Symmetry: C2
């Protein structure tokens, strides 16, 4: 009984990738895509902690994408990472937090950021 | 005078390159009060072993009241393996774009609600 395991669903068009919570502790959450062998599953680690002064919060998200050798028993060849570090001020307005979010969503969505990550092309056109 | 343009609905936010060195650039929204203009800082470095690239992007958003009362920051640290496939880098990108776009990530940043439903 009780709640099912928590998920977050990523959409790429009609396609979806579901990441399921596998750990929730004082220090962090870990979500994994429960598809394929265990080695090399897509991982998202998340934490939310107040700073020492209790004037801000720090959100950390770490997306770990392992690459697995095609043949033989599963082994990680390499791992690539995209992590986020978000500083949210405790006396901030909702509109300011929503703006930071909206602008970051837009930034990440740009073809420029895509070309930076995929082709190492510097920003600016 | 190179730019990157961010769209939030029908609002357009144009960031203009104001500084650029060997592997670090600063873009600024050249509008509004001189103080606390939206800023994006980007850099690219190789790791010590020359086996990966590190991309950093830092969006700094000041809240101005002549005086910045506070600054909120959303930084990205991307580790790109030198001998990776294009498909793997594209996937890392596509998964991250989708992740940031989720209502869950909005609720985390705006409302401090942890991920997972």
């Amino acid at each position: 009984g009780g709640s099912m395991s928590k998920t977050i669903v990523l959409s790429v068009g009609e396609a979806t990738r579901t990441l399921t919570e596998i750990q929730s502790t004082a220090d962090r959450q870990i979500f994994e895509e429960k598809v394929g062998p265990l080695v090399g599953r897509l991982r998202l680690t998340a934490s939310l902690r107040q700073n020492g002064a209790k004037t801000a919060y720090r959100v950390n998200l770490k997306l770990d994408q392992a690459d697995v050798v095609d043949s033989g028993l599963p082994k990680v060849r390499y791992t690539q990472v995209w992590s986020h570090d978000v500083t949210i001020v405790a006396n901030s307005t909702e509109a300011s937090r929503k703006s930071l979010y909206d602008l970051t969503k837009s930034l990440v969505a740009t073809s420029q950021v895509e070309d930076l990550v995929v082709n190492l092309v510097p920003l600016g056109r």
